[PDB]
Amino acid sequence: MMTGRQARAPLQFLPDEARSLPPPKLTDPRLAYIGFLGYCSGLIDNAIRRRPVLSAGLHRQFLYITSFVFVGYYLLKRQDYMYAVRDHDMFSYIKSHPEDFPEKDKKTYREVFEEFHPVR
Amino acid sequence: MLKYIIPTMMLMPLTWLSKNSMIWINTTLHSLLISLTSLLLLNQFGDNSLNFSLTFFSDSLSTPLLILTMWLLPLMLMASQHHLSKENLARKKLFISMLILLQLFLIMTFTATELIFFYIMFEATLVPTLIIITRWGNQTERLNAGLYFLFYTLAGSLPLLVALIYIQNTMGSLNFLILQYWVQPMPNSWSNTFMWLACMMAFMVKMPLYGLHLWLPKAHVEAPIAGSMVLAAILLKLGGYGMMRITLLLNPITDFMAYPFIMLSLWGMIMTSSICLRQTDLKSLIAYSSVSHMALVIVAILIQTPWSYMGATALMIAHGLTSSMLFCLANSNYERVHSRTMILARGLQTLLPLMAAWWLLASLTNLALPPSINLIGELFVVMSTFSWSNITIILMGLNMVITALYSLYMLITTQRGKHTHHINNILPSFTRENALMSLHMLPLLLLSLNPKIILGPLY
Amino acid sequence: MNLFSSLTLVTLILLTMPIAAINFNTHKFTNYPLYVKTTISCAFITSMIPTMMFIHTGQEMIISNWHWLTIQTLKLSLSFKMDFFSMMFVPVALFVTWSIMEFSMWYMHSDPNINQFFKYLLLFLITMLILVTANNLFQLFIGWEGVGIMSFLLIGWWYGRTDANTAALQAILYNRIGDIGFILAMAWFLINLNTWDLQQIFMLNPNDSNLPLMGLILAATGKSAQFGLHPWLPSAMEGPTPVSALLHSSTMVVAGIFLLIRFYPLTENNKFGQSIMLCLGAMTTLFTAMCALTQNDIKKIIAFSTSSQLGLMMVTIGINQPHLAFLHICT
Amino acid sequence: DKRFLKLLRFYILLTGIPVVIGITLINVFIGEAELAEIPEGYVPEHWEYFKHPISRWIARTFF
Amino acid sequence: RDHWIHVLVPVGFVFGYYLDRKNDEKLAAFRNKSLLYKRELKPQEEVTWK
Amino acid sequence: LRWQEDPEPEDENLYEKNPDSHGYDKDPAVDVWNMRVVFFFGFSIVLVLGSTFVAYLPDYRMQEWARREAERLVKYREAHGLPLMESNCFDPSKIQLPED
Amino acid sequence: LIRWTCARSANVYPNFRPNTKTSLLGALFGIGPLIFWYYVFKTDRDRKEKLIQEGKLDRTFNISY
Amino acid sequence: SWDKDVYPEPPRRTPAPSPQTSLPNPITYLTKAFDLLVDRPVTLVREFIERQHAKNKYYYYHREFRRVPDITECHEKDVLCMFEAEMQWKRDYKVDQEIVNIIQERLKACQQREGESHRQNCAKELQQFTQVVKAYQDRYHDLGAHYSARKCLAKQKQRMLAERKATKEAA
Amino acid sequence: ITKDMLPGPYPKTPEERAAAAKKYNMRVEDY
Ligand SMILES: CCCCCCCCCCCCCCCCCC(=O)OC[C@H](COP(=O)([O-])OCC(O)COP(=O)([O-])OC[C@@H](COC(=O)CCCCCCCCCCCCCCCCC)OC(=O)CCCCCCCCCCCCCCCCC)OC(=O)CCCCCCCCCCCCCCCCC
Ligand SMILES: CCCCCCCCCCCCCCCCCC(=O)OC[C@H](COP(=O)([O-])OC[C@H](O)COP(=O)([O-])OC[C@H](COC(=O)CCCCCCCCCCCCCCCCC)OC(=O)CCCCCCCCCCCCCCCCC)OC(=O)CCCCCCCCCCCCCCCCC
Ligand SMILES: CCCCCCCCCCCCCCCCCC(=O)OC[C@H](COP(=O)([O-])OCC[N+](C)(C)C)OC(=O)CCCCCCCCCCCCCCCCC
Ligand SMILES: CCCCCCCCCCCCCCCCCC(=O)OC[C@H](COP(=O)([O-])OCC[N+](C)(C)C)OC(=O)CCCCCCCCCCCCCCCCC
Ligand SMILES: CCCCCCCCCCCCCCCCCC(=O)OC[C@H](COP(=O)([O-])OCC[N+](C)(C)C)OC(=O)CCCCCCCCCCCCCCCCC
Secondary structure: OOOOHHHOOOOOOOOHHHHHOOOOOOOOHHHHHHHHHHHHHHHHHHHHOOOOOOOOOHHHHHHHHHHHHHHHHHHHHHHHHHHHHHHHHHHHHHHHOOOOOOOOOOOEOOOOOOOOOOOO | OHHHHHHHHHHHHHHHOOOOOOHHHHHHHHHHHHHHHHHHHHOOOOOOOEEOOOOEEEOOOHHHHHHHHHHHHHHHHHHHOOOOOOOOHHHHHHHHHHHHHHHHHHHHHHOEOEHHHHHHHHHHOHHHHHHHHHHHOOOOOHHHHHHHHHHHHHHHHHHHHHHHHHHHHHOOOOEHHHHHHHOOOEOOOHHHHHHHHHHHHHHHHHOOOOOOHHHHHHHHHHOOHHHHHHHHHHHHHHHHHHHHHHOOOOOEOHHHHHHHHHHHHHHHHHHHHHHHOOOOEHHHHHHHHHHHHHHHHHHHHHHOOHHHHHHHHHHHHHHHHHHHHHHHHHHHHHHHHOOOEOOOOOOHHHHOHHHHHHHHHHHHHHOOOOOOHHHHHHHHHHHHHHHHOOOHHHHHHHHHHHHHHHHHHHHHHHHOOOOOOOOOOOOOOOHHHHHHHHHHHHHHHHOOOOHHHHOOOOO | OHHHHHHHHHHHHHHHHHHHHHHOOOOOOOOHHHHHHHHHHHHHHHHHHHHHHHHHHOOOEEEEEEEEEEEOOEEEEEEEEEOHHHHHHHHHHHHHHHHHHHHHHHHOOOOOOHHHHHHHHHHHHHHHHHHHOEOEHHHHHHHHHHHHHHHHHHHOOOOOOHHHHHHHHHHHHHHHHHHHHHHHHHHHHHHHHOOOEHHHHHHHOOOOOHHHHHHHHHHHHHHOOOOOOOOHHHHHHHOOHHHHHHHHHHHOOOHHHHHHHHOHHHHOOOHHHHHHHHHHHHHHHHHHHHHOOOOOOHHHHHHHHHHHHHHHHHHHHHOOOHHHHHHHHHO | OHHHHHHHHHHHHHHHHHHHHHHHHHHHHHOOOEEEOOOOOOOOOHHHHOOOHHHHHHHHHOO | OOOHHHHHHHHHHHHHHHHHHHHHHHHOOOOOOOOOOOOOOOOOOOOOOO | OOOOOOOOOOOOOHHHHOOOOOOOOOOHHHHHHHHHHHHHHHHHHHHHHHHHHHHOOOOHHHHHHHHHHHHHHHHHHHHOOOOOOOOOOOOHHHOOOOOO | OHHHHHHHHOOOHHHOOOOHHHHHHHHHOOOHHHHHHHHHHHHHHHHHHHHHHOOOOOOOOOOOO | OOOOOOOOOOOOOOOOOOOOOOOOOHHHHHHHHHHHHHHHHHHHHHHHHHHHHHHOOOEEEOOOOOOOOOHHHOEOOOHHHHHHHHHHHHHHHHHHHHHHHHHHHHHHHHHHHHHHHHHHHOHHHHHHHHHHHHHHHHHHOOOOOOOOHHHHHHHHHHHHHHHHHHHHHOO | OOHHHOOOOOOOOHHHHHHHHHHOOOOOOOO
């Protein structure tokens, strides 16, 4: 859909306009969930190699957590960028096509007739 | 809702870091603390629901289901710790993890503000239940049972998903609070007819509707005791909750779409109750009685009056407590004679008198003895269905005859008559067993003192 | 006022006190039957004071003391109707029950479960006075199903006997067939009159009262063992003799008759309901007195006797004489 | 059965007798609120719309 | 602590309770702005609820 | 013959090794503390304090308020000669009907 | 006893054959009463709805439903 | 106590005791025994508890909801206005429910109080009951379990179209 | 309990009728 939008400047994971956007906080709950997924990967890595699950290889568990948080931070940056691009294109298209988006006359319910259906 | 979701999740490190002799005690203790905490959901208002966030809310429909759900977990742990005593320790912790995970999915099934998140938690409940039945059920047929439970649900629920996404494309939202104000009337057409079926048939399977009920006397029978407790007490009520939410969007087409299903329920409660008169398996009898009781909840939701919704939510809470207690009583006899045949162990009041008193009280609540909330829900549904059509009292009243007849027959066969001579392993009732019966029966009887908290959002 | 209502509620709370004593126990009782019999003799004495001051002035009241539940326009309260029917039936029932329990201290002396027997007999008496003192249909239905359940538990007192269990379940079956009509009446009064209270039923006074009175007649046919729903009362002789003496002769089985006496402002304006009650009562009193002419079990003869007397009570309701029917109950 | 019933009554009464004694002392010595008209300019707290002290405490503490 | 495992579910309550209160400040756009409950602020008051 | 299988283990009686068993565990100290946890946190905490909590709910779903408010409105419109309730929920001056 | 309880439940469908007898009994006792109670309740509610919309059904004190 | 206008009672006329016999009735002796043995200790305990209440007096309030705009002057699908209109409608519906309950309590109290001449002497309470039940039925009946202010407004507009058509055809 | 003591299909040959009569602990002439 938006593939011609990111085709004049291809293969940019985060373009330069993405820096206009606020980055995800480090206490982002999505980023905390990705760190939790890294911790679960570290536990499964101890489990399949028959290491003691919570205790063995704390350096390896911490590199799992760190690597998932590291990749996931940039994935969340790109996610928020693409939804911001989606809304920017939507609003610029509505602003440039007023004949397709008229302001509908809102009626109050004193004029609005709705059919009544009795439950009896 | 996150003050309940996070302690329920903290039960997972609590069960996996506990000492091996402490995993029942610790999970029972802290699940009882979560259940005590669940009464803060009774901050309900006469006009507004208790709306926590964009994701979660709780009106007077979801609140008793939440309190019953959070109450059922310690009782399931007490019911299950004896027959899993010889189990491997990690499999025991995995069993407790499946119960905790099922509680976690249920409490945000009932509080899900948005309907597709309701759908995802609603269907997420399948996986721990399927695992509990097929892994810790006792017999061969559990595997076949796990298929029926899986595939009557999904075949009903995958058209719901599409239907909900269609509403997402039509209304722009699936927030139930937005849909309270943006609901448009659903006229008579074929498109809206299959819209109605896609919105309703997943919950018809969950209730179960008569004719769609066949998964239940396999799934509740072949399950272990905690599986049967949560299946009868909570997971049937996902269908009633989902109907009470989804029939907002289905007016006025419901006024003639309900006619076949009402027939299937009104005759179905005559059939399945009659089936209970000739059941040889006691646990199958309790399962068919659950189908018969949920038929009234189906009729009450489809006729959609205030009295019928009040009776249906009272009957859902009351049936949850009563059916869970009846499965626990049948399990207490199964853990002595190792057979679910009801005619096998007879005359048990001569051997086990206090457990016979628990059988008596659970039978009296099953036959809706006033003033139990069983009778409150039963009676209010009967009032509303009499107003719907005066002839229904026939099929209502005849049901209350047969409901009495199978309730006492169960009580006469197992408790009365002469004891079986060759059965000599009838141990005296453990403190755990009488405790389990009292933790079902005492809240059930105390709710008769103040039933307004289980009468739902339009009390 | 303050004497009448206080001693009214003291009679009922006093009856509930030995149930609380037997449920909160640790020891083997020093003659719990004597305690229950002393309690019921004292409740007879306490119930005689509102009866005397009804005989003096005609003093009647309603004690709606506890708001229980409001279903939008149906306020349900714990409500006690102290009128002529309660004022005469409560002392007669307490006097009869006091004799039944001093009889039971002899007759049931060999029974190892005599405390459970006196507990069940007192629970019957409590549910029967809930039935006869009720002001709304829900509380009357509590008393109604309560005397049905205590009837079950007391017919099947010797529960290893197959005939006792069969007779107890038969009594349940016929009474639930009558409860169909009870719940029909409750449904009609709620939908058409917006009430279960007797006062609004009598004040609205509906002319199209065929269907609720047919429901009440079906409920009395079940409860008072009229023809068609009669054989459970001769089957109920399978219980012990104090059960047959208290419940199945004098106190429980008049309840259906009592129900139609309670709704006499509706039956007096319905000649069709009067004719139905007249024909049903005459059919019952002929058939059961005819059955009693050849029986050999003495309790079966007395059971067909009292079902014939209940048929006579149904007759005198059917000739629009409800106070003679109530007098024949108390007699 | 007797041991179960003794332990059941013990653990119900263990908190129930202090709860009944405390409710009695609250009803006697603290006592119940009196209905009053709202003064001019006074904005009541949300727990001040309830009559019993335990209800006001629940409304102030939890709800 | 010798009984450190008995604080997992209670602190998970409190922290959960904390997050609920922390969410309320994110849903305070209509605080003292509803037509039903808008009012002038009392002295030494900055918000009508927290 | 058929394969190598453990025979059926006989069903254990918890009262044999522990005649004071509450049925929670075969270790008697764990059994007694499981009993105390179930009874204290189930009956002493949830049932008693929970029933006390429900008994003193602050006007659950504004029923009592609604009586008292009704006792205001009746008293306003008994005295002013107004009817106790109108058939119209909404003022007919603020309703446009579809003309015909 | 085990043989009886197995015959009553699990052996029934392996020994079911759809023929004239089982089809004519399964449709008489399975969908027959559904059609019957459908037409009874439908005729009753059509008659009652017609009486209410024609102002003939006495609904004077009916406010609970 | 309560307000004697919303819960009215006629003045009590009890007759003076005119004993014709020489036998003393037990009711006067039991009334004196109830006054001595029962009523005075209960009164003293209540006076003690009432002094303990008067030592610490505090107040609660009846919550006053101001009137927000109703559903007729809310724009269609405007959830912020029609939410408040819906909450106002639900509160008014709950209060109308309690008004019907008050009038039913008056009707039942009159039926017990007037006794055997209840049919003549309770015509005013019966008439008020009939008026308020007709108003409640026109306002809220047949809306269903999913009632709202929109359903009630649609019911009122249907009833007003029927009344306008009946007025037009009769002129 | 085992598989050849459970109920099975309808007996057609006389030896099948004989072995199912033996299974239900009764005579072939009575089965
Ligand atoms: C007692 C121990 C019981 C056992 C302990 C353990 C119990 C088990 C565990 C329970 C745990 C709690 C469970 C949750 C419940 C929480 C409490 C609650 O919700 O209370 C609700 C409710 C409201 O309490 P509240 O909101 O706190 O107070 C409202 C007031 O506005 C505010 O109150 P107030 O300020 O207006 O009143 C203050 C009141 C304090 O308030 C209380 O005590 C009420 C709280 C007690 C609640 C107890 C509930 C537990 C269950 C009790 C029932 C079962 C007991 C065993 C069985 C008995 C037989 C059945 O003061 C008094 O009590 C003192 C007055 C004493 C009068 C009698 C003596 C006078 C003469 C004395 C002469 C000698 C001295 C002369 C000189 C004196 C000089 C100074 O309280 C009650 O219902 C109290 C129970 C009694 C009710 C009336 C009983 C008679 C009714 C008869 C007719 C109706 C029934 C007909 C049946 C017919 C047969 C079928
Ligand atoms: C908030 C505060 C509330 C305080 C008040 C409590 C309110 C009710 C709560 C629930 C009470 C049930 C507890 C007893 C039954 C279960 C255990 C048992 O069987 O023990 C036998 C045992 C004594 O027997 P045993 O000789 O040692 O051995 C038994 C034998 O093996 C052989 O046994 P058996 O067959 O000879 O004897 C069993 C017998 C068998 O008798 C029957 O089955 C006949 C019952 C039905 C016909 C008669 C009643 C009909 C309805 C009228 C009553 C309700 C309305 C009354 C109002 C006026 C009208 C509107 O049952 C009884 O006598 C129980 C009396 C109460 C029956 C309640 C209705 C059950 C019927 C089914 C449902 C009906 C609708 C629900 C009603 C709910 C009312 C609140 O009892 C005890 O040791 C009691 C332990 C302590 C109980 C505490 C109860 C409260 C627990 C709640 C805790 C939290 C709040 C704190 C309150 C604490 C208060 C102290
Ligand atoms: C548990 C077993 C039974 C389960 C039953 C589940 C429900 C049964 C009915 C499902 C119908 C299919 C989904 C409908 C979703 C409705 C969404 C919608 O907008 O509909 C209107 C739309 C209308 O199209 P539209 O909305 O795009 O058009 C615009 C609107 N108009 C019409 C005005 C121009 O309906 C459809 O497009 C088709 C609806 C019928 C679909 C028929 C194919 C499926 C048949 C039923 C299969 C059921 C499961 C089979 C498997 C059984 C077990 C193995
Ligand atoms: C031995 C123990 C007794 C108490 C000992 C200690 C106290 C000593 C003596 C002093 C008395 C205590 C103070 C007065 C009592 C409290 C008074 C009071 O206002 O209480 C508040 C209220 C009075 O009612 P209310 O109308 O004020 O409030 C009810 C609450 N709303 C409005 C929300 C509905 O509650 C009670 O009094 C509760 C006790 C009721 C007693 C009867 C119980 C029957 C249970 C049956 C269950 C099923 C019923 C189904 C059928 C119903 C009918 C259809
Ligand atoms: C709830 C949904 C999920 C279901 C499962 C939940 C399980 C989890 C458990 C959580 C805790 C328990 C929750 C439910 C609590 C219900 C109890 C409760 O709150 O009650 C409040 C009720 C409410 O009554 P109330 O409304 O009148 O209270 C008045 C309100 N105040 C107190 C503020 C003035 O409390 C009472 O009734 C207290 C009065 C005394 C108790 C009754 C005494 C008499 C009982 C019968 C005596 C014998 C009569 C004759 C019979 C003879 C023998 C048969």
